[PDB]
């Protein structure tokens with residue numbers, strides 16, 4: 001499309017500037033003369049594939065909007081949508097910069113355990129809202145870039161980008177989530193549920209504090225190998241029901257599984273989250289040695305919560321309500 005600054009749409013919106021680009025199209029800053037406020041307009045490409053998937057995004061945002069709870073306010077607000085020049089246009093409140101930009105601004109050294117906690121509490125409350133039975137929405141693409149500050153002065157956040165999202169039992173794609181944040185059940189080709197967003201969140205929170213992705217795989221095989229370095233071989237009962245188990249693993253006579261190895265990873269379960277976090281060693285790279293709010297006891301609570309979020313079994317992985325009751329969140 002490539003929209004000029006100064007362009008006026010429908011005697012209502014004046015286009016200012018490009019905010020961002022994506023596979024879906026583009027996000028522009030625009031002035032709404034009716035509400036008298038700035039808005040972010042997500043402009044979908046005029047191609048059937050992108051239109052049809054953005055129509056699901058619009059449906060799921062409208063579904064969330066009509067459930068006024070108190071847990072609804074960690075999702076970006078869709079104000080309205082329209083068709084213009086054969087592009088579906090989604091009008092959102094303006095938010096600020098994203099949590100990947102936040103990490104880039106720390107030179108990838110991470111934010112404090114106290115700021116990590118504030119993000120974790122908001123995100124767990126968002127996931128509790130999506131798990132409302134009448135919604136049952138799987139975000140499917142949680143990552144730092146898809147979490148935006150509400151205000152550059154403040155630590156409030158909202159989730160954006162429901163472009164991959166589906167309701168439970170309305171799955172389209174087997175291959176979903178951004179690779180670094182992709183759950184073992186998705187890597188293993190298994191039917192997925194809301195628990196894949198909790199996996200992503202556990203990956204996200206470690207990264208927000210260390211500055212670096214927990215599992216930075218170059219491809220699905222490297223991904224699973226990096227998860228196994230930290231968490232060990234997945235349980236047999238999961239691998240036994242997994243269509244893609246033999247992408248990564250090999251079963252042996254006695255009903256046990258091991259990695260397929262290629263040409264020359266740390267042995268399974270030996271890259272300890274205890275050491276990645278630096279629980280007993282002054283935090284990541286020892287850079288938090290001495291800082292208040294970064295005691296061993298504070299770290300052990302964080303580590304415990306993360307290891308519950310990174311349960312291989314989506315049935316036993318911690319769920320949002322129970323994550324909100326964790327000791328990590330008690331003052």
Ligand SMILES: Cc1nc(N)c2c(C#N)c(-c3cccnc3)[nH]c2n1
Pocket residue numbers: 019020022027040042076092093094095096097148160161162
């Ligand atoms: C400044 C700003 N405000 C927003 N509301 C969004 C917004 C939304 N919703 C997205 C976005 C990014 C990726 C995919 N879809 C939407 N970028 C944004 N920037």
Ligand SMILES: [Cl-]
Pocket residue numbers: 100143144145213
């Ligand atoms: Cl990232």
Ligand SMILES: [Cl-]
Pocket residue numbers: 140141164175176177178
């Ligand atoms: Cl996806």
